[PDB]
Amino acid sequence: AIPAPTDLKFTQVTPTSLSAQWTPPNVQLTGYRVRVTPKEKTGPMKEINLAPDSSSVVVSGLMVATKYEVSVYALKDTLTSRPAQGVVTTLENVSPPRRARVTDATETTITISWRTKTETITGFQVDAVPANGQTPIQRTIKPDVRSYTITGLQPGTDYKIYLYTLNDNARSSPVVIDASTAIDAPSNLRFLATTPNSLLVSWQPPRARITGYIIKYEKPGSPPREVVPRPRPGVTEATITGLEPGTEYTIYVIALKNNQKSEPLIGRKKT
């Protein structure tokens, strides 16, 4: 007479599957018999034989929104343990988003778009997880929507975006897409010092984890030139030299993150 498997639990229920797990009986086993049967005679009952070293099972191909009785028998040749039993109700049907795409990216927002099978939907869930140890941004989305903008994000930041279809309690697997907010510009250009041949420019730092700056300058009728060398992060002042006296120059300050550039901070100053 064999001991029943012990400590049965279910680790996941989906619309068409269930995952169970148990502590094997402390005995030499032949195998297992797993019975999954619909409580009301609404459809197919399932029965799965397992290796004797089994400790867990995933039973798929089930009917959605259906109550099932679950029985795990431990087997030793001609002997059968009493069953470890559980009850499971599968979720309502639900399918992941199709063709999910990032369509727009700003310093503070990201816009995504997707399609779906024509099924009953009650909503969507999105989780935007930043790459920098920071806290995820979770939002809930109305069911008729196919385009959404996640607002209040950090500039110059990488996000993994997890989008799920909701149908009441049923949540689909996430679709996973990648995007990055724009590098935010330096702000507040000030010309601290002026000479007939030079300017000392000043700016305030952006909020992104930048790797450097570019400074460009430009007179009417000339292509822009960069200040050498590029200012390193932490720097908030730079000198532009070798200019003409009495000339209007336009200054562009670009924040860098590796090879990504912000839109330029711009300003003008004479001589």
Curated annotation (Swiss-Prot):
* Residues in Fibronectin type-III domain copies: 4-97, 98-184, 185-271
Spans annotated as Heparin-binding 2: 1-271
Q: In which tissues is it expressed?
A: Expressed in the inner limiting membrane and around blood vessels in the retina (at protein level). Plasma FN (soluble dimeric form) is secreted by hepatocytes. Cellular FN (dimeric or cross-linked multimeric forms), made by fibroblasts, epithelial and other cell types, is deposited as fibrils in the extracellular matrix. Ugl-Y1, Ugl-Y2 and Ugl-Y3 are found in urine.
Determine the domain of life of the protein's source.
Answer: Eukaryota
> Where is the protein localized?
Secreted, Extracellular space, Extracellular matrix; Secreted
Please describe the post-translational modifications of this protein: Sulfated. Forms covalent cross-links mediated by a transglutaminase, such as F13A or TGM2, between a glutamine and the epsilon-amino group of a lysine residue, forming homopolymers and heteropolymers (e.g. fibrinogen-fibronectin, collagen-fibronectin heteropolymers).
Effect caused by changing L163R: In GFND2; reduced binding to heparin, endothelial cells and podocytes; impaired capability to induce stress-fiber formation
Coiled coil stretches, renumbered: none
Q: Where are the annotated segments for Binds to FBLN1?
A: 93-271
Q: What does this protein do?
A: Fibronectins bind cell surfaces and various compounds including collagen, fibrin, heparin, DNA, and actin. Fibronectins are involved in cell adhesion, cell motility, opsonization, wound healing, and maintenance of cell shape. Involved in osteoblast compaction through the fibronectin fibrillogenesis cell-mediated matrix assembly process, essential for osteoblast mineralization. Participates in the regulation of type I collagen deposition by osteoblasts. Acts as a ligand for the LILRB4 receptor, inhibiting FCGR1A/CD64-mediated monocyte activation.
UniProt subunit comment: Mostly heterodimers or multimers of alternatively spliced variants, connected by 2 disulfide bonds near the carboxyl ends; to a lesser extent homodimers. Interacts with FBLN1, AMBP, TNR, LGALS3BP and COL13A1. Interacts with FBLN7. Interacts with COMP. Interacts (via type III repeats 9-14) with TNFAIP6 (via CUB domain); this interaction enhances fibronectin fibril assembly. TNFAIP6 may act as a bridging molecule between FN1 and THBS1. Interacts with TNR; the interaction inhibits cell adhesion and neurite outgrowth. Interacts with FST3 and MYOC. Interacts with SVEP1. (Microbial infection) Interacts with S.aureus FnbA.
User: So which disease is it linked with?
Assistant: Glomerulopathy with fibronectin deposits 2: Genetically heterogeneous autosomal dominant disorder characterized clinically by proteinuria, microscopic hematuria, and hypertension that leads to end-stage renal failure in the second to fifth decade of life. Spondylometaphyseal dysplasia, corner fracture type: An autosomal dominant form of spondylometaphyseal dysplasia, a group of short stature disorders distinguished by abnormalities in the vertebrae and the metaphyses of the tubular bones. SMDCF is characterized by flake-like, triangular, or curvilinear ossification centers at the edges of irregular metaphyses that simulate fractures. These corner fractures involve the distal tibia, the ulnar aspect of the distal radius, the proximal humerus, and the proximal femur.
UniProt protein name: Fibronectin
Covered part of the full sequence, start to end and full length, is 1812 to 2082 of 2477
